Amino acid sequence: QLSRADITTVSTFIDLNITMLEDHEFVPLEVYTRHEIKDSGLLDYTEVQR
Amino acid sequence: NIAPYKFKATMYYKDVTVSQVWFGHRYSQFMGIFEDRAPVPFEEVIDKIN
Numbered sequence: 121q122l123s124r125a126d127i128t129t130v131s132t133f134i135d136l137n138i139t140m141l142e143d144h145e146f147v148p149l150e151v152y153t154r155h156e157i158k159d160s161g162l163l164d165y166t167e168v169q170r
Numbered sequence: 171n172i173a174p175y176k177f178k179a180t181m182y183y184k185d186v187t188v189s190q191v192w193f194g195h196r197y198s199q200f201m202g203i204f205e206d207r208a209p210v211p212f213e214e215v216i217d218k219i220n
């Protein structure tokens with residue numbers, strides 16, 4: 121009696137590798153926050169009047 | 171870069187205020203007030219304030 125792995129084996133199937141799409145996490149990103157846009161002005165009427 | 175160049179500065183001025191007052195029999199009234207911001211000379215900013 122001999123084991124099943126003692127004889128050479130050939131794959132009769134046509135392998136098809138399937139790599140699922142990895143999960144992705146999106147982080148917040150802004151070129152200029154609303155605070156930066158407000159600060160872009162040279163003068164602010166609110167602060168000047170205050 | 172939209173942020174304006176921010177730097178610290180010190181202002182020096184005198185609030186010159188000359189008012190005209192009319193004295194009645196039983197009351198006082200301001201016939202005119204002249205407010206002006208007079209600048210401080212370099213000699214005073216250096217030899218007196220600083």
Ligand SMILES: *[C@@H]1O[C@H](CO)[C@@H](O)[C@H](O)[C@H]1NC(C)=O
Pocket residue numbers: 135136137
């Ligand atoms: C992936 O597919 C290939 C054939 O494209 C196959 O040879 C391989 O054994 C499969 N599995 C792994 C883990 O690479």
